[PDB]
Amino acid sequence: GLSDGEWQQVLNVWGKVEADIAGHGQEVLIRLFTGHPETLEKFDKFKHLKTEAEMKASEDLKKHGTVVLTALGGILKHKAHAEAELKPLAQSHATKHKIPIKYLEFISDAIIHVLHSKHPGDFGADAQGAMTKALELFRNDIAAKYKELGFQG
Amino acid sequence: GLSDGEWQQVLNVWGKVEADIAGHGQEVLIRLFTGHPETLEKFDKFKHLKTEAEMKASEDLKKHGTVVLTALGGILKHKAHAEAELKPLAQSHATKHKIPIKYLEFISDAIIHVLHSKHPGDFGADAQGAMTKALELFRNDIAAKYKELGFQG
Numbered sequence: 001g002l003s004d005g006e007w008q009q010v011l012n013v014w015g016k017v018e019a020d021i022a023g024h025g026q027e028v029l030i031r032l033f034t035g036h037p038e039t040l041e042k043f044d045k046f047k048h049l050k051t052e053a054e055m056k057a058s059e060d061l062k063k064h065g066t067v068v069l070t071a072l073g074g075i076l077k078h079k080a081h082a083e084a085e086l087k088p089l090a091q092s093h094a095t096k097h098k099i100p101i102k103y104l105e106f107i108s109d110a111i112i113h114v115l116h117s118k119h120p121g122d123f124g125a126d127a128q129g130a131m132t133k134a135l136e137l138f139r140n141d142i143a144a145k146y147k148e149l150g151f152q153g
Numbered sequence: 154g155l156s157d158g159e160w161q162q163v164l165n166v167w168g169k170v171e172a173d174i175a176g177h178g179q180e181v182l183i184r185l186f187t188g189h190p191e192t193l194e195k196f197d198k199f200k201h202l203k204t205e206a207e208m209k210a211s212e213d214l215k216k217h218g219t220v221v222l223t224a225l226g227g228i229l230k231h232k233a234h235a236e237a238e239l240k241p242l243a244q245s246h247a248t249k250h251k252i253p254i255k256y257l258e259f260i261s262d263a264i265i266h267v268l269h270s271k272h273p274g275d276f277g278a279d280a281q282g283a284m285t286k287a288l289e290l291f292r293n294d295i296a297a298k299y300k301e302l303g304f305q306g
């Protein structure tokens with residue numbers, strides 16, 4: 001649901017996070033724990049942290065903050081990149097070409113057929129099952145954008 | 154979703170596709186158009202081709218097959234890399250840490266507050282709206298993985 005400009009805005013502020021990932025992560029976890037103490041109960045390794053001051057002093061709360069924001073930064077970058085790639089394809093296939101999801105199923109079946117035909121050795125039952133699932137995820141991704149665009153696929 | 158091995162099987166067969174992307178593209182569209190002749194009617198430049206032999210001689214069809222498989226390969230590779238990060242997070246937060254979606258909402262609130270507090274210049278109302286949508290996409294992705302695992306979240 002984000003424009004390329006909106007994802008640039010998300011990644012722009014994320015650059016500022018990366019300038020001090022530990023400080024940001026410490027501040028996020030302390031905001032979370034102080035506002036919603038029930039969340040701190042989920043962290044058995046932080047049972048010794050009672051006060052804001054103990055939280056601020058904690059070497060491991062700060063290290064965990066880095067772990068959380070490092071993971072979330074990677075996820076946001078990869079989501080921005082996927083969207084910029086998928087959105088125009090979904091746009092053209094909904095609005096210009098008007099390709100039903102059934103037709104995307106036909107081409108998916110055609111891809112599996114050609115890979116089985118050309119690579120029987122390296123495309124056995126397990127690999128064919130993997131590709132079958134991956135192509136269904138792709139179709140589902142397109143189908144979700146078709147519904148956002150109001151196109152009945 | 155795919156297991157880690159299933160994603161690697163997809164990447165491995167896609168390397169074979171890329172080693173002869175022209176031939177794979179041709180064979181995929183020929184299979185689509187022969188199995189499902191209604192699909193050919195979408196392609197102004199091809200809809201006149203009757204036989205596999207004619208389809209194979211069409212430089213236009215060959216060109217298009219390469220465009221299709223290039224686009225799909227990028228989508229598959231990006232999904233594989235993204236799922237490598239999201240799958241294990243969802244798995245640990247469902248089955249080991251038992252983190253409800255409403256606590257990912259709490260930490261999202263904290264992230265948005267901390268960014269606004271530290272970086273007001275890079276976190277105006279529009280950039281805040283973008284980051285709010287982006288963290289909602291992250292939580293919905295985790296929610297969908299939670300539903301797959303049967304974790305109420």
Ligand code: HEM
Pocket residue numbers: 039040042043044045067068069071072241242245246250252256257260
């Ligand atoms: C932006 C949201 C979040 C991200 C990206 C995130 C990421 C991570 C990562 C990367 C780890 C270490 C690897 C793992 O076990 O999967 C972790 C551990 C953990 N997370 Fe999260 N987390 C998030 C939200 C939460 C919330 C809201 C809670 C609790 C209320 C939580 C509880 C935990 C716990 C208990 C651990 C184990 C920590 C330990 O004992 O070392 N997570 N998290």
Ligand code: HEM
Pocket residue numbers: 088089092093097099103104107108192193195196220221222224225
């Ligand atoms: C794996 C599935 C598919 C992929 C990755 C894909 C990719 C593409 C790409 C990259 C283009 C050129 C850029 C664009 O217009 O978006 C395109 C064009 C097109 N696609 Fe698809 N496509 C897929 C499935 C289909 C199917 C199943 C059909 C029809 C049955 C279809 C019909 C078209 C048409 C008619 C065009 C315009 C052709 C032209 O004017 O040159 N696509 N496709």
Ligand SMILES: [O]
Pocket residue numbers: 068
């Ligand atoms: O976390």
Ligand SMILES: [O]
Pocket residue numbers: 221
């Ligand atoms: O296509």
